[model samples]
Target chain A: RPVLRSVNSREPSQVIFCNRSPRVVLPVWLNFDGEPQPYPTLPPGTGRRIHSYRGHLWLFRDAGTHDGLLVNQTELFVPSLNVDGQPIFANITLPVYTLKERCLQVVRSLVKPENYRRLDIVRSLYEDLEDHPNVQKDLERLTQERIAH
Target chain B: MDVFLMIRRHKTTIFTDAKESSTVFELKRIVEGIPDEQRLYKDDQLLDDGKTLGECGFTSQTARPQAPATVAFRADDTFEALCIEPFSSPPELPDVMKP
Candidate 1:
């Protein structure tokens, strides 16, 4: 599904995409249109340093399967430019694998439900995600908890 | 899952842990010296104080066996700078988010 992307960018950043995982991972940058563009693959324990913009978004995926990977557990990484207009060092690490429940939970929190509804791609993602066994069970638990309260 | 946070303040570093559901505020509570207004940052992006680690898409994924994730934190108050040193001039607040 389409997600947030860079727009009117400035504020310098030096992002180091570090692959801490033992497996190979692909680095993908999302353009202003929220389209994912592929980049060089990162071998295990290797890192690629890039000079990028503050609002830019970057995602990593498993080289073998196109499933998205997490950066410190995040689905996307944004090069940051705090108060300093100059480039700031941003080290983002890719893990071997992302726990499904953990990853979805984070994404749910990051994107608000209203915002999710506005984006057809994101809303569609939830429809697919709800089918996840644990996700369904987790929602069941929440409903049950609410009933009791 | 238990999250081990590797927090750094300039040359200073500390190891700490919290539950996966803990909020950023809760995580900061476990550390000493850092002020309340200070925020935790990963790769230069500032984390929200009220959001839980679960909400932020973090898990107990370790880089190396028993290793922790590196996070930078800072508060812009001059008071903290003095407390952190022998009247050392206020260290430039590097980790504070711009907007």
Candidate 2:
């Protein structure tokens, strides 16, 4: 994903996109000043750096296919990925404890039944962690939330 | 023979049937229902529109018991596009910050 930083004329500006995912990502499609630019595809663990006088909006689908279908296609939006000289980092992996918390976040935020089913297989994969307090708590909360909704 | 389609997304599992000659897009429609905008992915790979069920790897002669194959679905709203222009640069740093 590309972030626009240092827009003011007083400082140098840069537009950067990095694919920190474990898998390869499709080309980032970007549009600036109403002009759409077909950006290059990004390989796994790679990034692109460019100078930009104007802020540009960019979007990319999850890495899966080149034909452009919706499988893992999750479109995300960001107002600005500001970088203070340090590179922007987007890592999907997290500690197991943190991962559970994040998983709960997804579960709790789900508004549709389809989204719930989306995480079914993932939960099954973590069957071993079913007894863990955090996991149990999340499950209980999800049950209550589901009932309430 | 009926080609069983087990489309999984999050906690939801959808089962549908497709003919061997049915195109991948047809399966997507079955899995996604109406609006005709859902995209189907098999094993994290997007299914091609032109390919048939067999071509895309769905088969009736599976070695597995349930013929379970995981496919994913997401609505068109899942994709987003935005554009921003850096019209003005940031404020200049203080003299003390100057190199």
Candidate 3:
């Protein structure tokens, strides 16, 4: 729910692009003045600045490739860039454990004892994904941290 | 009591034991009966597949066993995807926008 808001009300005419994902780099295509316009790839930890235009829309490909994954197809409108000084920050920390654990906590708190089997299946899905590269590293790190503690 | 939750969209079927805890992913599968994967959103809140309705503060007593809950399942238009393709229509000023 993070949005780039402007401090001064000078038409709020700037649209700033920020790449926040820790690992994934994104390629951007833009729709402006009612036409599709291809732009450059946005690397992780990068940002772009452009003027707000009318009849603007955008679509994105995974890695600046037309044959790549067409990641998003939506018409979004934003008025301004991050306020003069207040910048939008990215949390580059590992959110895998925190986010996944939050999900598990919700399930554990809400799932009933009678439906434990269903919970078992759900937890098993989590276990199955434990070997995913990013998650595996985080889990291993946490395990080491726990052992030390 | 078994709550019969039906998904109208994806035109699919899913098995849910109301006696058990139902996660958002399970409900999504009920609605998205096909093998295809898509996340669900309600009121613009991207539901966590790992979380359950009980964790979101819903219970059998409130959803009512007999009166099954009619949930609207939305396909994937996740915020993560938005990080790349930022705009859907056109750019407008920040104060007037909601995304």
Candidate 4:
């Protein structure tokens, strides 16, 4: 196993917000079988002051909507802003199983307000999906009914 | 310092106990929990032959499957314990049947 000691970087006042976190931030460092391995430092949470010699991995999950895919962004947490910056917040829907296993017990804290959607909304969405069939006629009928209304 | 990672091999309708730090043998014991002991030997041999995880190139040092299971923790040790990864295939049997 590899030992990874975190070096705290102090900031001025505001809470630090990184564009993304690592996909698989190995909770433990890796110790290989054949020979001894050296510990490697991850991207430090700094700007030009800190540099990265290695690249990180990202995981993207596709979904029903254009944003249907769940994206877990992993990148260096650079304090300086990028050339193109979108809104920092967007609400995403996470499954109950994921919420529980990730030890998201107090998700209200782990996640930002925009990080999670209302459970009722999620449940409603699932329920709506459960009742709907794959029949094209049914879909056409619903579409026609909506246009008529 | 040894780093350990736990990954969930199976999906769940309710429970998803993802990966964590355990010795290479601990996984064998975990697989042993299944009633079918015949398959246990095959898995044990894989783990023992250095064909299983060690082949992947990482050593699982924290777990000791001797008299008791042991896990040594270090100050630098961190645990991800996230549900980010999903099972490529759902288990043929349900969680209830397996558990």
Candidate 5:
């Protein structure tokens, strides 16, 4: 029961796509180059505007599954592309083992020999996410400290 | 077995049916016969987000149009159904004990 935030979420879009369950972009991201663009959708007479984001990639969802009420709202699936031919996603799949391997592969690709040295500090930053709560407090404190600076 | 839904529209309840395998998408088509003005929440979240009716595995046209299994719905041969207005409650319930 995560209440959706309509405000701009400052986190990296890529991480949010990979880690979060499906989420719609707020109105801020829907405008293109400062101009708002209309989205194409069905139920012609329904008068609902489709959701969008700034990035070129549009999230895809299974519209047929959404006919019900709240808790039962359709489950939207987001697809992610990996270097390998198959797509990898952070969402749990039918078989957990397959997704676990996909996650590992993504980590390996991030730290591969060709990209190794230059990215260690960046890699350490991601590694630090393993200590979740500490990072949360650190970020909250850092944001507060920023105002003083 | 045939499936059915007695949906409430405006001030009336209507009966409709379809084979058990129909999807919710198809159900929308069937419910379309109900007048448009009666549906306020339709646009808010009536149909699925964007996938086709077939993709959601729906094949029936009943209140419970989908299949019972974990997998999505599939089409059917025939069904029995009905529909009525979803219940409406009073503007506010009276306090049980306080004045």
Candidate 6:
């Protein structure tokens, strides 16, 4: 039986998890076979630094609710910054957020804040999509609808 | 005079710590795996068990090899040459995260 794991070479690295979200986040290390090995949760505003290889794959999952989040900023951390003479390091920010909150965040950017129409659509979302997986995709689809009309 | 090293095969690799003035006879004793009596080499140069690591063209006598120097081992009788260069591929890690 052949098992799978990443080959650790001379390419050493350190990845720092910066939990910029208000809620807790989970960092999962995916094995070569794509298995989820969950690490400890990172509290809001907390950060963790762990040694990693260049070929390692990591996933950021919401600890409490595995829902969609805002794509407002950068997501992946690249280990470019050097710490003294050791291996390189990187910092990744968590994008933990809710669909309801995401709607308001997108609405504010789409139309004027004082407009009642923007406020109406903010409340016009289907209640079923509160935690839907495609809510964010459909949310942008809705944004496209607004753009079309 | 301590030096860290990476004892490796083409498939898997491991790390070990040894003295800079240590000989291959002593280095094999410290690293406790792949212990089936195999000859070691770096950049395809056969390592002599009698000579110090400094004489092995590892580094200058006064230099400390803090960074792990790769030493490849072979289990076969045929002494195939190694890559004999720096890291095989220069990896520029992706800075931006993809969803």
Show model 5 residue runs off by greater than 4 Å: A1-149, B34-45, B49-99
Residue pairs in collision within model 6: A76-B97
Specify the highest-DockQ model's number: 1
lDDT of 5 at A20: 21
lDDT of each residue in A18-134, candidate 2, tens digit only: 665644555443343222344456676677765543333344533442212111223322233446654332332112235554454344333232234433345564443333233
DockQ for candidate 5, please give it.
Answer: 0.01
Please report the candidate that would top TM-score against the real structure: 1
* Per-prediction TM-score, chain B alone: 0.61, 0.60, 0.42, 0.24, 0.35, 0.61
TM-score of every candidate: 0.37, 0.28, 0.23, 0.20, 0.18, 0.34
- Alpha carbon RMSD to native, model 5: 22.3
In the range A86-108, model 3's lDDT, one tens digit per residue, is 43322221123455544544443
Model 3 stretches astray by more than 4 angstroms: A1-12, A22-34, A64-149, B1-99
TM-score of chain A of 1: 0.55
Order the numbered candidates by TM-score, best leading.
Answer: 1, 6, 2, 3, 4, 5
Query: Which has the better TM-score: candidate 3, or candidate 4?
Result: 3
Task: Please report the interface RMSD of model 3 to 1 decimal.
Answer: 15.7
Give the per-residue lDDT of model 3 (tens digit) for B1-99.
334442223333233434337677676555544414555543245567788776654556655544554333223742222111222584442331222
True-structure lDDT of candidate 6: 0.54
lDDT string for model 4 (A57-132, tens) is: 1112111111111222321112222225322221122322343324333333333443244333355443432332
Query: What is the per-residue lDDT of model 4 for residues B1-99, given as tens digits with 9 covering 90 to 100?
Result: 333434322242122121333344555555445312212122223233223443433443532222211111112444222223354784464222232
Number of the candidate with higher lDDT, 5 or 6? 6
Instruction: Please report the candidate that would top lDDT against the real structure.
Output: 1
For each candidate, report its DockQ versus the true two-chain complex: 0.02, 0.01, 0.01, 0.01, 0.01, 0.01
lDDT of 5 by residue, B1-27 (tens): 655444444355556665554555455
Cα error, candidate 6, residue B50 (Å):
86
